[PDB]
Design a protein around this ligand. Structure first.
Ligand SMILES: CCCCCCCCCCCCCCCCCC(=O)OC[C@H](COP(=O)([O-])OCC(O)COP(=O)([O-])OC[C@@H](COC(=O)CCCCCCCCCCCCCCCCC)OC(=O)CCCCCCCCCCCCCCCCC)OC(=O)CCCCCCCCCCCCCCCCC
Ligand SMILES: CCCCCCCCCCCCCCCCCC(=O)OC[C@H](COP(=O)([O-])OCC(O)COP(=O)([O-])OC[C@@H](COC(=O)CCCCCCCCCCCCCCCCC)OC(=O)CCCCCCCCCCCCCCCCC)OC(=O)CCCCCCCCCCCCCCCCC
Ligand SMILES: CCCCCCCCCCCCCCCCCC(=O)OC[C@H](COP(=O)([O-])OCC(O)COP(=O)([O-])OC[C@@H](COC(=O)CCCCCCCCCCCCCCCCC)OC(=O)CCCCCCCCCCCCCCCCC)OC(=O)CCCCCCCCCCCCCCCCC
Ligand SMILES: CCCCCCCCCCCCCCCCC[C@@H](O)O[C@H](CO[C@H](O)CCCCCCCCCCCCCCC)COP(=O)(O)OCC[N+](C)(C)C
Ligand SMILES: CCCCCCCC/C=C\CCCCCCCC(=O)OC[C@H](COP(=O)(O)OCCN)OC(=O)CCCCCCC/C=C\CCCCCCCC
Ligand SMILES: CCCCCCCC/C=C\CCCCCCCC(=O)OC[C@H](COP(=O)(O)OCCN)OC(=O)CCCCCCC/C=C\CCCCCCCC
Ligand SMILES: *P(=O)(O)OCC(C)(C)[C@H](O)C(=O)NCCC(=O)NCCSC(=O)CCCCCCCCCCCCC
Lengths: 178, 87, 52, 99, 128, 459, 69, 174, 54
């Protein structure tokens, strides 16, 4: 989520993702911890057996057959963490996330109810306003003429600058806002 | 509800898990030790370490982000940033 | 701010028209494929995969 | 460009000049009195007074009158052994059928 | 070996089971790079507008405008009378009308015939 | 009726002689006063109508419509003052004048005692509406919408004029009381078939009937907020009122000529609800919901039983109020983000709570939720249709299911989910908008409390 | 440690609700008091036979005092 | 109670059995009834006594409107608009009165069903027959006139019914 | 939505009538303004009125 994706997954990345998914589904099948440890050791033994293979075509064929085996033997109801996309507690607190632009539409009485918070908020707003030109200049200087080849973003190269395109990442709502 | 996390608590828990890992020597394990450069592990070992951390903290780290956590300090910083821990 | 050239148009019948349509929708010319010209009103709108 | 055209103006926010704006008028006093007249007349006058007026509208539909007439007819007809509901609306003697 | 999984339209084919996922030509990699470049360009434009401090309003989406225009206003100009369109329109617009007319006509004719024959249970049927 | 007619013709010079900043205040105050005055028409008799003079009369069918019109005018004034802030004084006064003329024509239409005067007034209602649409619409399509609306209505209504003058020549009078008392059966002939067709087709186009309804999305989507409010709440009820008035002299030909219209109404009710399920525009969704409800009203009028007419009247009043409220809510959303796309603005419950409450109540009234007058009318129509035939229940159940589906789909799409991140100009809801919603919703609940006021003469 | 909770403005919704309640209760409470006093003191009319030779009025044909008025 | 007519709204005499306890345990129902009478019934009775005392000081009367009979549509000539108007109004009033009569009979039926409870199928046979007869007559009178019903249409229906009865009697006698 | 509402209900009643009116308008108004042509038309009209009308 925090990392910019690449154009494709390498063979190492594919096999590692298959390894993690197979281990998780095996844990779903093997509920108890000792049984899961035993069968996970056997699974890693299989992966180690096929670890050293010079023939990339054969390695890809092994990966494909392993993927078919995983799809046949996957748990119909695999365990999902509550906050994970398939989880039960997924997106439950999205209705509680409110942004700071909505925060600055408050009435003067509401703002007066929090005098110290809004002073620091004004400091943050000044920091945002005093850096946008430097950020856009840095972005347009470092980009290739063809355009952005990837979604990655650069850091601040100067002692007094900020990383470009930082405001919403830094001021995103808390994971438990209310 | 639950007590809030702290940077020290996260670091202690991740070092606890790593010291309970058998392939890692507890004496030479520091918070800046690299998993493959100076700990001598490999990709499957790192995947199992990330899975152990997921089990420890009760949340999933996506594969796109988990491949880059090659250091206990990196894992601590990732978890603190995701859980909004600043102290 | 959108101009008249940025709106969906008729079914493309030439490689130049298909290239222009693909450029309009921010797609590759190789990956752009219109709906078949059955006279159903789709025009040059892309036929993206039927996934969710 | 093909014309000497004005730029599209920015959207105007009523809360910027007047934080306690009711959304009626730019002028504060005019907006406040527009709110006051709308709320007073509409809510109080129309809603409350018209609702109680409609609630206490006299029984000009003669529902209760019809009920009392029905009570009298039922009492009279069941006292004398007559049918409660008559078979015909009109008088067959006063009706003249064709041959 | 293991039983094969048959994709459907409402149950598609997973990526890990796609045969083309394991036959990657060097041109496939450059196509993926071009797609990523397009996505990165669009993302950069959107993020610049989104993080602009002086922006107040809605970042207009030409893609959304095109979708809403093609769904509503671009249909008739690109519609042609073809055998397929003619038959489908005739069926979907006329057939149901005649079907329901026949159903209700038959039901009401049977009911009226029962009424005339005087063998339909209409006791207590006061409200109509 | 002059005690209500003259105050509108006095609203005109008051609007033109008031100051530049006081036009909205004066118009709203005096419109509310006129509505309160017109509330006295609800005291109706159980035997006959209120025959004020040779020209005007009031009935249990006309009274709720007149009260609805007089109540609808100030809400239109509020919405118009919302969206016409930068206009010039003369053009503001012209818009208010168009609204006042429309209200006056509608009042005289609902109270006209002759069919030819009724025709003249209900055709006169077109000019202010056309001017409003094609002049103060926001988009380019307002011109095409006005052309479609005008030509549909006129191509429907001209044969009605010919039929009315023919009926006057044949019978001696177009007075409604005389034609009701002196009515004679309509024999099955081609001439009578085409007379029935002329009258019914005029009012069906006004309804609108399915297959004669494209002008309704065209005009309703492209008209300004006040025009949208008046088009759905009142102007669609002229067709139903006319059909409930003319069908006195169209018997027994209505038993045999109503089959195509009943089939069109039922199937197109289903089809327009399904269309509502897949609308990318909120105004279009509201317009098609209006089409479905008026198709149900057409079914009631065509089956033509005392239980169907009461349901028709109740459903007309309820639909007017609910559709006006829905258009107002969608217009507030549009005034926020300057676009009518439904999926553009999301998370509006977390951004504007009380507007989410108003949306919830409006959607719950849009679907037949007991004991609302919407459900009262729909249930009466469904019971009458059940007595008519026993598969109409299948069609009505399908329509109710789809109605709930698309209403809650609109609610969940607009209000629930997560807000659009880049939309950062959604200011808190105005007191004026909240008051508009409250004035839309409270009378509906009070009518639910007292339901015999909107059940028509057949009660 | 107490953390600031970011919420939309509730001032305007609260103000509208307060104004609506005030203006409904501005006339509603007096109307309720008047209705209660009328019902308690000036009760409803009693049904009676029309005296011979007497011609009543319509408000004499209605029952509740407010409806008669 | 003298509020309504016992003949129009009959009630069978109420037979309540006397208490015959068989245990020394106190009756919670009796104790709670005593509490209810002490706490609620006496205050509401005093309040109603005060209210009725206030009502007795301002006694006034309202009357039931009497309508004399007028010639009906059978007596009215053709296109005699005034006689037709009077006859139509009288027919509408009679229609309302008949509707309320049917309502009274239905109220009788519902009350008897609820009262008899578990023996309603047998003890309510008298109120079912009265409802059957009343509804039959009302249906024969105003069954299928339509939304635009009138005295002329009802008279045409009665004429059709009379013609059918005459034809049936002639066929039977043949 | 598309096949019936946006295509065929538009094609039948409003679009076909507008097309016919436009075609007839073009046909009527497409004249070169030649007195020889429309006076020949006058002669034809006079002959038809004399013969076919009695
Ligand atoms: C209110 C609620 C809603 C209400 C409902 C609203 C919606 C429904 C109502 C509207 C329904 C549609 C409108 C009616 C049809 C309009 C057709 C039209 O304008 O066509 C112009 C349009 C333009 O003309 P074109 O450019 O010369 O041709 C272009 C074609 O793409 C290329 O043409 P092609 O050369 O490929 O054609 C091959 C083939 C095309 O047809 C087919 O392939 C279908 C064959 C079956 C259909 C005919 C069945 C009956 C045949 C026997 C008839 C015996 C009569 C005695 O031709 C034939 O079959 C021969 C002609 C058949 C004529 C039948 C009638 C006589 O032509 C076509 O679309 C061609 C097909 C026309 C007929 C289509 C089928 C109609 C079926 C009946 C409908 C009623
Ligand atoms: C073409 C297929 C077709 O005939 O569809 C009829 C069908 C009517 O529904 P249905 O349930 O099949 O008709 C029941 C019986 O079949 C027919 O009913 P019935 O047998 O009980 O006798 C009643 C019949 C008596 O029959 C006659 O009077 C036949 C003599 C010709 C009458 C022409 C009247 C035209 C009136 C203006 C129509 C403007 C369009 O009444 C009519 O014909 C009513 C004519 C007006 C129908 C509705 C007009 C609005 C259409 C909106 C969509 C337009 C696109 O659809 C249409 O009329 C519109 C779509 C087709 C165009
Ligand atoms: C902001 C958001 C919200 C917006 C909302 C929308 C906007 C709304 C706008 C306004 C709408 C207005 C609509 C029109 C209203 C017009 C008035 C009307 O229709 O009145 C109706 C009508 C009024 O009576 P009426 O028909 O005019 O007179 C007939 C009789 O002659 C009368 O009987 P009576 O003469 O024998 O004596 C009765 C008399 C006197 O009664 C008594 O004295 C009773 C005493 C009881 C206790 C006695 C025992 C305790 C004694 C303690 C002390 C003992 C020792 C001392 C004793 C005294 C000294 C010896 O009391 C009254 O007359 C008062 C009745 C209530 C008047 C309400 C006026 C409303 C005005 C409209 C505006 C309202 C705006 C809102 C603000 C309202 C104010 C805050 O009936 C009622 O009001 C009934 C109230 C409820 C009774 C119980 C009902 C059954 C409850 C259970 C049902 C099942 C459960 C369901 C759930 C729970 C319920 C939901
Ligand atoms: C459990 C859940 C229950 C929740 C219910 C919530 C409501 C509170 C209970 C109801 C209120 C107490 C009963 C009040 C009731 O009696 O009054 C109603 C009356 O309500 C009003 O009539 C509703 C007014 C509706 C008209 C409002 C018009 C305001 C302007 C709106 C214009 C737009 C309207 C367009 C269409 C006309 C019913 O009339 P009625 O029982 O007999 O009154 C008895 C008095 N009598 C005996 C003398 C007759
Ligand atoms: C023998 C009797 C028959 C004789 C004729 C009878 C007429 C029947 C009723 C006619 C309705 C009049 C509307 C038609 C006017 C002509 C429309 C036309 O010319 O089509 C072209 C025209 C575009 O060209 P212009 O707008 O003129 O400008 C172009 C700029 N470059 O098309 C349009 O978009 C105009 C559409 C007008 C409204 C659409 C028609 C409304 C519905 C028509 C049927 C009515 C339904 C009945 C219910
Ligand atoms: C092209 C095909 C068009 C078909 C649609 C018809 C519209 C064209 C109008 C041309 C008239 C065609 C029908 C003529 C019917 C007629 O004139 O007779 C009706 C009858 C004649 O009786 P007498 O002359 O006195 O005979 C005495 C017998 N001893 O007079 C009447 O009842 C008045 C009827 C008015 C004419 C109605 C013509 C239109 C029919 C209704 C269609 C309504 C269409 C509405 C348009 C909306 C949707 C497009
Ligand atoms: P680290 O970076 O050292 O990783 C080393 C890797 C693996 C990247 C190697 O360097 C490498 O690329 N080796 C050659 C490629 C290769 O290893 N291919 C084989 C991969 S799949 C494999 O052979 C093991 C699959 C067997 C297990 C399949 C699991 C299916 C069962 C799951 C069922 C679900 C519930 C149990």
């Amino acid at each position: 989520a925090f990392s910019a994706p690449a154009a494709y997954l390498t063979h190492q990345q594919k096999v590692l993702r298959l390894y993690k998914r197979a281990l998780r589904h095996l844990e779903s099948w093997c509920v108890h911890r000792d049984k899961y440890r035993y069968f996970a050791c056997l699974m890693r033994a299989r992966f180690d057996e096929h670890k050293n293979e010079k023939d990339m075509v054969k390695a890809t064929q092994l990966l494909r057959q392993a993927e078919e085996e995983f799809w046949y033997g996957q748990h119909p109801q695999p365990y999902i963490f509550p906050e994970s996309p398939g989880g039960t507690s997924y997106e439950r607190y999205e209705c509680y996330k409110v942004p700071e632009w909505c925060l600055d539409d408050w009435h003067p009485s509401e703002k007066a109810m929090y005098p110290d918070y809004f002073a620091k908020r004004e400091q943050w707003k000044r920091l945002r306003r005093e850096s946008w030109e430097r950020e856009v200049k840095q972005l347009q200087e470092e980009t290739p003429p063809g355009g952005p080849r990837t979604e990655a973003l650069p850091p601040a190269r100067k002692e007094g600058d900020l990383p470009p395109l930082w405001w919403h990442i830094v001021t995103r709502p808390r994971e438990r806002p209310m | 509800d639950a007590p809030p996390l702290t940077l020290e608590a996260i670091k202690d828990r991740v070092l606890y898990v790593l010291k309970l890992y058998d392939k890692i020597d507890p004496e030479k394990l520091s918070v800046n030790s690299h998993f493959m450069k100076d700990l001598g592990l490999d990709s499957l070992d790192q995947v199992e370490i990330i899975m152990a951390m997921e089990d420890e903290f009760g949340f999933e780290i996506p594969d796109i982000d988990a491949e880059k956590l090659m250091c206990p300090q990196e894992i601590v910083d990732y978890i603190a940033d995701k859980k909004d821990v600043y102290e | 701010h959108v101009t008249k050239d940025m709106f969906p148009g008729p079914y493309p019948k030439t490689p130049e028209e298909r290239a222009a349509a693909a450029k309009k929708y921010n797609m590759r010319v190789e990956d752009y494929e219109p709906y078949p010209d059955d006279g159903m009103g789709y025009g040059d709108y892309p036929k993206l995969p039927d996934r969710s | 460009i093909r014309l000497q055209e004005d730029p599209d103006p920015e959207d105007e926010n009523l809360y910027e000049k007047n934080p306690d704006s009711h959304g009626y008028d730019k002028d504060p006093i005019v907006d406040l009195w527009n709110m006051r007249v709308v709320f007073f007349f509409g809510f109080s006058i129309v809603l409350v007074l018209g609702s109680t007026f409609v609630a206490y509208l006299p029984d000009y539909r003669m529902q209760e009158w019809a009920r009392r007439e029905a009570e009298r007819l039922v009492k009279y007809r069941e006292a004398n052994g007559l049918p409660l509901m008559e078979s015909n609306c009109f008088d067959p003697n006063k009706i003249q059928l064709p041959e | 070996s293991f039983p094969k999984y048959k994709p459907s339209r409402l149950a598609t084919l997973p990526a890990t089971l796609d045969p083309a996922e394991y036959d990657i030509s060097p041109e496939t990699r450059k196509a993926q790079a071009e797609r990523l470049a397009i996505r990165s360009r669009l993302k950069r434009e959107y993020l610049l507008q989104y993080n602009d401090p002086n922006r107040l309003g809605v970042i207009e989406d030409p893609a959304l405008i095109r979708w809403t225009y093609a769904r509503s206003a671009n249909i008739y100009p690109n519609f042609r009378p073809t055998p397929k369109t003619s038959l489908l329109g005739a069926l979907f617009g006329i057939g149901p009308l005649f079907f329901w007319y026949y159903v209700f006509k038959t039901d009401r004719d049977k009911k009226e015939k029962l009424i005339q024959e005087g063998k339909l249970d209409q006791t207590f049927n006061i409200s109509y | 009726m002059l005690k209500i007619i003259i105050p509108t013709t006095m609203l005109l010079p008051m609007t033109w002689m008031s100051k530049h900043n006081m036009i909205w205040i004066n118009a709203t105050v005096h419109s509310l006063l006129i509505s309160l005055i017109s509330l006295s028409l609800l005291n109706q008799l159980g035997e006959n109508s209120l025959n004020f003079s040779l020209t005007f009369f009031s009935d249990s069918l006309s009274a709720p419509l007149l009260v609805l019109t007089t109540w609808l005018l100030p809400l239109m004034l509020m919405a118009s003052q919302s969206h016409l802030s930068k206009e010039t004084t003369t053009r503001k006064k012209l818009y208010i004048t168009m609204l006042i003329l429309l209200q006056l024509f509608l009042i005289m239409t609902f109270t006209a005692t002759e069919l030819i005067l009724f025709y003249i007034l209900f055709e006169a209602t077109l000019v202010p509406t056309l001017i409003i649409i094609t002049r103060w619409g926001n988009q380019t399509e307002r011109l095409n919408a006005g052309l479609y609306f005008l030509f549909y209505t006129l191509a429907g209504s001209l044969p009605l004029l010919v039929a009315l003058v023919y009926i006057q020549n044949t019978t001696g009078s177009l007075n409604f009381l005389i034609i009701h008392y002196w009515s004679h059966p309509l024999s099955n002939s081609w001439s009578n078939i085409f007379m029935w067709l002329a009258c019914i087709m005029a009012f069906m186009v006004k309804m609108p009937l399915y297959g004669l309804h494209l002008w309704l999305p065209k005009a309703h989507v492209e008209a300004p907020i006040a025009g949208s409010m008046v088009l759905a709440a009142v102007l669609l009820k002229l067709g139903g009122y006319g059909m409930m008035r003319i069908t006195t002299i169209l018997n027994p030909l209505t038993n045999y000529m109503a089959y195509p219209f009943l089939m069109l109404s039922m199937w197109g009710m289903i089809m327009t609800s399904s269309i509502c399920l897949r609308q990318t525009d909120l105004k279009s969704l509201i317009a098609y919901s209006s089409v479905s409800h008026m198709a149900l009203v057409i079914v009631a009028i065509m089956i033509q039983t005392p239980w169907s007419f009461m349901g028709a009247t109740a459903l007309m009043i309820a639909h007017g109020l609910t559709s006006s409220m829905l258009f107002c809510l969608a217009n507030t959303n549009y005034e926020r983000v300057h676009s009518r796309t439904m999926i553009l603005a999301r998370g509006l419950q977390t951004l504007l709570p009380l507007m989410a409450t108003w949306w919830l109540v409006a959607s719950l009234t849009n679907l037949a939720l007991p004991p609302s007058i919407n459900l009262i009318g729909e249930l009466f129509i469904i019971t009458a249709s059940f007595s008519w035939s026993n598969i109409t229940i299948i069609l009505m159940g399908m329509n109710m299911m789809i109605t709930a589906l698309y209403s809650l789909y609109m609610l969940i799409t607009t209000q629930r989910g997560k807000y659009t991140h880049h939309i950062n100009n959604i200011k808190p809801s105005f007191t004026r908008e909240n008051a508009l919603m409250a004035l839309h919703i409270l009378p509906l609940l009070l009518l639910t409390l007292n339901p015999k006021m909107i059940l028509g003469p057949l009660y | 440690k107490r953390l600031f909770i970011i919420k939309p403005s509730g001032f305007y919704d609260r103000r509208f609700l307060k104004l609506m309640r005030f203006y409904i209760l501005l006339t509603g409470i007096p109307v309720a008091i008047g209705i209660t006093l009328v019902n308690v003191f000036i009760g409803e009319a009693e049904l009676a036979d029309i005296p011979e030779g007497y011609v009543p009025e319509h408000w004499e044909y209605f029952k509740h005092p407010i409806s008669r008025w | 109670p003298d509020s309504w007519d016992k003949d129009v709204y009959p009630e069978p005499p109420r037979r309540t059995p006397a208490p015959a306890p068989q245990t020394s345990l106190p009756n919670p129902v009796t104790y709670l009834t005593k509490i209810f009478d002490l706490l609620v019934d006496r205050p509401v009775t005093l309040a109603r006594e005060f209210i009725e005392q206030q009502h007795a000081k301002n006694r006034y009367y309202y009357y039931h409107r009497e309508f004399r009979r007028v010639p009906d549509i059978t007596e009215c000539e053709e296109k005699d608009i005034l006689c037709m108007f009077e006859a139509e109004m009288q027919w509408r009033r009679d229609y309302k009165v008949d509707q309320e009569i049917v309502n009274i009979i239905q109220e009788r039926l519902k009350a008897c069903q609820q009262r008899e409870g578990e023996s309603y199928r047998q003890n309510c046979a008298k109120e079912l027959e009265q409802f059957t007869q009343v509804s039959k007559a009302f249906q024969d009178r105003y069954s299928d006139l339509g939304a635009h019903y009138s005295a002329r249409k009802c008279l045409a229906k009665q004429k059709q019914r009379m013609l059918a009865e005459r034809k049936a009697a002639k066929e039977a006698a043949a | 939505s598309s096949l019936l509402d946006l295509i065929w209900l538009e094609t039948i009643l409003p679009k076909t009538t507008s097309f016919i009116q436009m075609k007839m308008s073009i046909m009527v108004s497409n004249q070169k303004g030649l007195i020889k042509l429309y006076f020949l038309s006058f002669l034809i009209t006079i002959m038809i009125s004399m013969t076919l009308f009695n």
